[PDB]
Copies of this chain bind each other. A is one copy, B any other.
Amino acid sequence: SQVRQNFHQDCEAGLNRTVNLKFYSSYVYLSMASYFNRDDVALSNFAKFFRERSEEEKEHAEKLIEYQNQRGGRVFLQSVEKPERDDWANGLEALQTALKLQKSVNQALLDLHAVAADKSDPHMTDFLESPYLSESVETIKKLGDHITSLKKLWSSHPGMAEYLFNKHTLG
């Protein structure tokens, strides 16, 4: 690329890997959002929450793809694996997996950032920090809060827990 400058191939490859990870995340969130809209689950706000998280990960994936081009990198798309499960049991379990997924996505961003810094790319490093890295801690803290509130109610009544959380917290 005539545009390419100070863009290492490990940064290029890492970008493609993380791009796939972001699509995989949105796919997982889409799976969760669909499960909650089931007539036998009926947690509308839980679904909306996972639906938004889905669009957000997709959006990131596209901004990473767009970043690949801006730097003169070449984007190579891989297949996106389906979620580990089609049934997410309940809201607490759904929230818990989301937190784990967020932490792995964050770990991926942190690792890529490391290689970017390693190769002395202040631009990529800066790009990853905001809003990617910042968004992760915000979402992780937010998920962590939701799980706490749900757990406090879960002990009282699980069925009512999801219902209340669904109306008041995710509403």
Contacts and interface: CB of A to CB of B under 8 A. Distances in A.
A152 B163 contact: yes
A129 B37 CA distance: 24
B86 A5 contact: no
Q: How large is the interface on A (under 10, 10 to 19, 20 to 34, 35 or more residues)?
A: 35 or more
Given A39-B1, A122-B128, A80 B77 contact: no
Interface of A: 1-3, 5-6, 27, 30-31, 34, 37-42, 44, 58, 62, 65-66, 68-72, 74-83, 86, 99, 103, 106-107, 110, 113-114, 117, 120, 122-123, 125-126, 128-130, 133-134, 137-138, 140-141, 143-149, 151-153, 155-157, 159-160, 162-164, 167-168
